[PDB]
Amino acid sequence: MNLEILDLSILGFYSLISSNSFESIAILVATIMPVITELWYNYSQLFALLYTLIYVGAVVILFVFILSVINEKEEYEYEYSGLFILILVLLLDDLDDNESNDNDYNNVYITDYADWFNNYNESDLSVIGNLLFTEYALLLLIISFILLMSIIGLILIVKKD
């Protein structure tokens, strides 16, 4: 019983009914959490933790910006919607969940055959660091160049003087 379906259905229901900005940043948290958990199992545990390390810090900075901008607008603005139409919209979106139309690729399972040739076994993060600092060191240096531009960019935009 894939419980990931139920969690996404609940998340999608609140996306259509979210009114204030606080409910929107809560939607973002309710989006990263299914991504991290579904990454923690199945595909990649490494990037599930990397998503938590980086995006959670961004969420707090996002949240503290909301406290400086909320201006009573959505605390009294009315919304109409309707319970019946919201469920109908979510039901129709539930009907089609096939992102690809290659039936053979989606219905036939495959296996891999492991080999003992790799006596030197290390984590994927070490291999990423091996290539990032040697093969693609230019990308790493340009990324630091972009980070430098952001630091200068933030100061000039925000600082009054």
């Binding site: 040739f117 790799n118 006596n119 030197y120």
Partner: protein, 78 residues
């Protein structure tokens, strides 16, 4: 000039004294950071005076002998 700000290219030693006294969080953070590359430049001195580098690890797969197969090899046959 009992407490003036020294000019770096005229009094380099006095200029360093100003930051060591007024900005300790800057003078000593750079001093610790500088010793990193400094020890890296002293590596050749260690290579000749203390000991040599270790042999590289066999982290490149199975070591295949650089020779043709021995066609005269038998034993443990079917």
């Amino acid at each position: 000039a009992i407490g003036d700000y020294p000019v770096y290219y005229k009094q380099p030693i006095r200029w360093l004294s100003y930051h060591a006294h007024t900005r300790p969080h800057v003078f000593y953070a750079i001093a610790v950071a500088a010793l990193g590359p400094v020890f890296m430049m002293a590596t050749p001195l260690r290579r000749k005076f203390l000991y040599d580098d270790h042999e590289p690890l066999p982290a490149n797969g199975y070591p295949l002998p650089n020779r043709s197969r021995d066609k005269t090899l038998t034993g443990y046959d079917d």
